[PDB]
Write a protein that binds this DNA or RNA. Structure first.
Ligand SMILES: [Mg+2]
Ligand SMILES: [Zn+2]
Ligand SMILES: [Zn+2]
Lengths: 150, 91, 103, 25, 82, 53, 102
RNA sequence: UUACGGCGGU
RNA sequence: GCGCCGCUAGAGGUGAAAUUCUUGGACCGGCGCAAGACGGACCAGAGCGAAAGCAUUUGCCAAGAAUGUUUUCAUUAAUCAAGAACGAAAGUCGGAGGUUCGAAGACGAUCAGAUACCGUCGUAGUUCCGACCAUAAACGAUGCCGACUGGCGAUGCGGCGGCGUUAUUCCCAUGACCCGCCGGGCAGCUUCCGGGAAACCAAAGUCUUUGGGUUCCGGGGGGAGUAUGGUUGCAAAGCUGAAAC
């Protein structure tokens, strides 16, 4: 089930069997790439590239058009960030909880949810260090943590 | 490094005066020597003068507070009640 | 103490990312006397003759004074820096509506 | 005899054998 | 219910199940063409949309995101494409 | 005078009766209690108005 | 043995319900275990009804009600006989006894 | 309202 | 509890009483005030939470489940020695507070005796702030994760689809109800699914037709959670933990 909560929900997206480009989509493989090159320079991360060109461009999934993933073509010419998007949002959340807990020292549940989030940071950092995504001397310290997040 | 494990500030009193009187002192003694944040200039410069007197290094403001601590909890409850009685009944 | 403060200090940490700003007393005093200031924000901590002569110049420059509900050390964290600050002046809002709000 | 009042008359009793050992050092 | 032929389900037993858990899994979603009243622009908005959809010609609002299925704001044309 | 006259028929409870039944319908909607907190120094002619016509 | 399937108590997804206090012995019970009884008793004691309508200032006056919600511990509920002992298979219904008002 | 005990082996 | 009145001689308490409070006027009735607790009825085999636990309005926050998803990453996972975080009540230390309740204690009854039940009073304590202590019938007496194996009526939360009723609605969108389906949850009712020593269990089933992963732990009753060593705590004690017999 869910990792740090006792929920066993079944809700995740179900792709169709046909991997082919839809017939009505009169749009190339190159034009969706240069659109990705536009709006990823507009501060956007690859989890939210694909949702706005699903809701207003008819592109169901970029890999069915281009053949490559969204982050995989950001990374092809050097405009994807150093931190991954999932590791970024955990550190953004752990700074936010710890900033709460300084003022609210007597919150025993913000104290408990902090070490669940902070353990997900190291369970995820232990993966990207083995895949040579992060450098092997990387470390989530708390006193440098707000510097990583924008 | 790690110089003590229990006594802290009352390691200057040596073996003397009793363990439970030295433990009673070290709440008072960390509190009268602590710097407090000034409510007037925001700088943590509230040093204690004589007993009941609290003073700013910068902005030079003197405050009449508690004896061993800046706010007495009896005097915060009253200030809550005085401004409540001043907005109730409007005299 | 529940819902509404991130009208004014979520917009403040959005002007800080996008638009222009000056911090400190004698910088918003230059910006107020040569037209470039738009909305000066005073902390609830500043000395009460400093609060008067910024309320008096903003009447002379026809600009707004928002009275922030917090410490000058609290307005500094709300800006997003490790300071304390009584008086700021935004001299360009980035894309938000602090002037188009209540003051 | 009840088992929470058996626990009391051994807790009362092993503070009494702990104290005589303290006397005869 | 021992010899239920669970390799050829009926289309109304296939439809009233999860988007997972089927004989072959498939989305419940669709892409829809939305024509605004008073523009020459076909928009190709996803059904379970999530954003404030703005157009190009008449850049007004076109659908509201909600919990499940995005709600077209004013009475506007609608067809289920493919 | 117009305030206290409104709650002999309790039109306040009937006004929020109409204005709430597009949210969840309600049925027993009264002004349960009215408590007095202040009095304005008791001008004598105001009481003599109340016992006039 | 486990005597009842619930443990006398109507809590399922909880860890602690409020302690309330019994009425005729002032003993502290959980709110779910407690044997409630809501009494809508007429305040007039129906033999004494034609002695207050013949001495009223009306000919048609609706009499007020007394709305006392008792709740008991199980100790005083069995002694004051508001719950009766039941056989080991006729325990298993949650329907209250029928009205029998006339 | 009060109502406490019933030698051992068979 | 205290003020300012009103009229009266008892009030209170009990199985009966008494100790007790009362013409320096109790109790009761009226109007005010103050203090500290606590949030009735609504309140449910309802919800949330890792568990302890959580209930008056509105307010700055920071989190979370489920559902929806033609988003993204692409094995990042399950259980977990050592090591930690949280932990009812009582308890301990200090500062506030101190209304009710009330271990200890004093007194009145009850009895053969009452060191008990019952009654009057009351300390520590119950309340808040800070630091500790780390245990409970901390219980579904049932580890966590995964799949599979009957039916049914519902309920709580999302989502989808439907006749009609009802709302400013004199049309609409969104609500309230009505009829279904989908996922997740709290449970219930039935059944020769099967199991069990049976009580009972849709899990405690899928087991001599015995093997899905993994942690903790049991080996006749006492001695004994004792003795002793270590370790923690201010203390009370917690943790580990035998043997002779
Ligand atoms: Mg006992
Ligand atoms: Zn100062
Ligand atoms: Zn009772």
């Amino acid at each position: 089930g869910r990792m740090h909560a006792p929920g066993k929900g079944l809700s995740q997206s179900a792709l169709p069997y046909r991997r082919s480009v839809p017939t009505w989509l009169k749009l190339t493989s190159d034009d969706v790439k240069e659109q990705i090159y536009k709006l990823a320079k507009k501060g956007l991360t690859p989890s939210q590239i694909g949702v706005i060109l699903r809701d207003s461009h008819g592109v169901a999934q970029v890999r069915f058009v281009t053949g490559n993933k969204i982050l995989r073509i950001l990374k092809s010419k050097g405009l994807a960030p150093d931190l991954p998007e999932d590791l970024y949002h955990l550190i953004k959340k752990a700074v936010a909880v710890r900033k709460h807990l300084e003022r609210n020292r007597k919150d025993k549940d913000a104290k408990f949810r902090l070490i669940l989030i902070e353990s997900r940071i190291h369970r995820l950092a232990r993966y990207y260090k083995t895949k040579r995504v992060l450098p092997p001397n990387w470390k989530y310290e708390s006193s440098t943590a707000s510097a990583l997040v924008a | 490094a790690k110089r003590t494990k229990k006594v802290g500030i009352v390691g200057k009193y040596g073996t003397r005066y009793g363990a439970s009187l030295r433990k009673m002192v070290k709440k008072i003694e960390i509190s009268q020597h602590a710097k407090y944040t000034c409510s007037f200039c925001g700088k943590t410069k509230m040093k204690r003068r004589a007993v009941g007197i609290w003073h700013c290094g910068s902005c030079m403001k003197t405050v009449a507070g508690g004896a061993w601590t800046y706010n007495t909890t009896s005097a915060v409850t009253v200030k809550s009640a005085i401004r409540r009685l001043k907005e109730l009944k409007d005299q | 103490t529940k819902k509404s403060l991130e009208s004014i200090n979520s917009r403040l940490q959005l002007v800080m990312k996008s638009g222009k700003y000056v911090l400190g007393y004698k910088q918003t005093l230059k910006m107020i006397r040569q037209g470039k200031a738009k909305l000066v924000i005073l902390a609830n901590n500043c000395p009460a003759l400093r609060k008067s002569e910024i309320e008096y110049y903003a009447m002379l420059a026809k600009t707004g004074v928002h009275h922030y509900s917090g410490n000058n050390i609290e307005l500094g964290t709300a800006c997003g820096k490790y300071y304390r600050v009584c008086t700021l002046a935004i001299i360009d809002p980035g894309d938000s509506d602090i002037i188009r709000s209540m003051p | 005899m009840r088992a929470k009042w058996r626990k009391k008359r051994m807790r009362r009793l092993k503070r009494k054998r702990r104290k005589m050992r303290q006397r005869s050092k | 219910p021992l010899a239920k032929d669970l390799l050829h389900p009926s289309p109304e037993e296939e439809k009233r199940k999860h988007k997972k858990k089927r004989l072959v899994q498939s989305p419940n979603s669709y892409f829809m063409d939305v024509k605004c009243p008073g523009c020459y622009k076909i928009t190709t908005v996803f059904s379970h949309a999530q954003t404030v959809v703005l157009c190009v010609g008449c850049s007004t609002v076109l659908c509201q995101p909600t919990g499940g299925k995005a709600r077209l704001t004013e009475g506007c044309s609608f067809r289920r494409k493919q | 005078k117009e305030v206290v006259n409104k709650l002999i028929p309790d039109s306040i409870g009937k006004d929020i009766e109409k204005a709430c039944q597009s949210i969840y319908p309600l049925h027993d909607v009264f002004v349960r209690k009215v408590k007095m907190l202040k009095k304005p120094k008791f001008e004598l002619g105001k009481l003599m108005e109340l016992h006039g016509e | 043995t486990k005597k009842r399937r619930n443990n006398g108590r109507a809590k399922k997804g909880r860890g602690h319900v409020q302690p309330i206090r019994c009425t005729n012995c002032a003993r502290c019970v959980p709110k779910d275990k407690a044997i409630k009884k809501f009494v809508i008793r007429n305040i007039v004691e129906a033999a004494a009804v034609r002695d207050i309508s013949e001495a009223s200032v009306f000919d048609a006056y609706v009499l007020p009600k007394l709305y006392v919600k008792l709740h008991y511990c199980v100790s005083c509920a069995i002694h004051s006989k508001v719950v009766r002992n039941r056989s080991r298979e006729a325990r298993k219904d949650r329907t209250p006894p029928p009205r029998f008002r006339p």
